[PDB]
Amino acid sequence: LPMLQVALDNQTMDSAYETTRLIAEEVDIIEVGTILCVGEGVRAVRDLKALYPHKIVLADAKIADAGKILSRMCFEANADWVTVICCADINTAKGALDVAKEFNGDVQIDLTGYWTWEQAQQWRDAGIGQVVYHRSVDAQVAWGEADITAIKRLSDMGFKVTVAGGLALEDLPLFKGIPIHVFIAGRSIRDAASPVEAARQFKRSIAELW
């Protein structure tokens, strides 16, 4: 089944823990959001993995350059996965992937903002097996067909695809039949009246649909 990832887009650890203390056991992947990477630094990764060592911890660092150095900082802090931003020089992505393999982790290319299909082919040739597809800034409404198409295309290229960007529970059926690797929910879990029910509804719907 598609896994469920909670995005901790919080500025401080104590703010993140308001969420993890409710839903850490209700999700598969705990993301240190970019906000939290910048707010607290790599200690966020270390602390969250120590708390939840049975979960996959993703550092959403959106690495733009210095692939080897930044990825090593994250993996030394016990990250499982890290993100590299889509416009990074291809050697950045390769650098991050080489380090990831030393730690038995993985790299995802984060498809935030402008990227091209030629670049996608480069990442595939480079050995990248994961991408994160985002619904756009302004787009946030309704997951449109151009997204679905792009997602299927990335899937057909051999990427495990993550779906992200204001994801709501009701969006899930649009992706039926596509082997989505992960669905990310940040606000739709963190800011729900009941974060536990929000996470459980996501998991229930995924199980119905796949």
Ligand X SMILES: C[C@@H](O)[C@H](O)[C@@H](O)COP(=O)(O)O
Task: State which of residues 7, 36, 45, 63 lies at the interface with ligand X (CB under 6 A).
Answer: 7
| Amino acid sitting at position 169 | L
User: Hey, CA dihedral for 46, 29, 31, 82, is it positive or negative?
Assistant: positive
Please choose, out of 21-29, 70-78, 163-171, 202-210, the segment that lies near ligand X by the rule CB under 6 A: 163-171
Q: For residues 139 and 116, is the Cβ–Cβ distance under 8 A?
A: no
* Span 96-125, contacts to ligand X by CB under 6 A: none
Alpha helices in 41-184 (DSSP H): 43-51, 67-76, 90-102, 117-126, 145-156
Which own/partner pairs from 48-52 qualify as long-range (CB within 8 Å, at least 24 positions apart)? 48/8, 48/16, 48/20, 49/77, 49/78, 49/79, 49/80, 50/78, 51/20, 51/24, 52/20, 52/24
C-beta of residue 183 within 8 angstroms of C-beta of residue 31: no
Whose Cβ is closer to Mg ion: residue 2's or residue 33's? 33
Q: Which is nearer to a second copy, 30 or 88 (CB)?
A: 88
Q: How far is the CB of 141 from a second copy (least distance, A)?
A: 8
Please tell me whether residue 184 binds ligand X under the rule CB under 6 A: yes
Q: Which residue among 10, 20, 34, 92 contacts ligand X (CB under 6 A)?
A: 34
Q: Find the part of the chain contacting a second copy (CB under 8 A) among 23-31, 111-119, 123-131, 143-151.
A: 111-119
The amino acid at residue 44 is: A
Q: Which is nearer to a second copy, 119 or 205 (CB)?
A: 119
Distance, CA of 3 to CA of 133 (rounded, Å): 15
Contacting residues toward a second copy, per CB under 8 A: 9, 11, 34-35, 37-43, 61-62, 64-70, 73-74, 85-89, 91-92, 94-95, 110, 112-116, 119, 134, 136-139
Contacting residues toward ligand X, per CB under 6 A: 7, 9, 33-34, 60, 65-66, 137, 164-167, 184-188
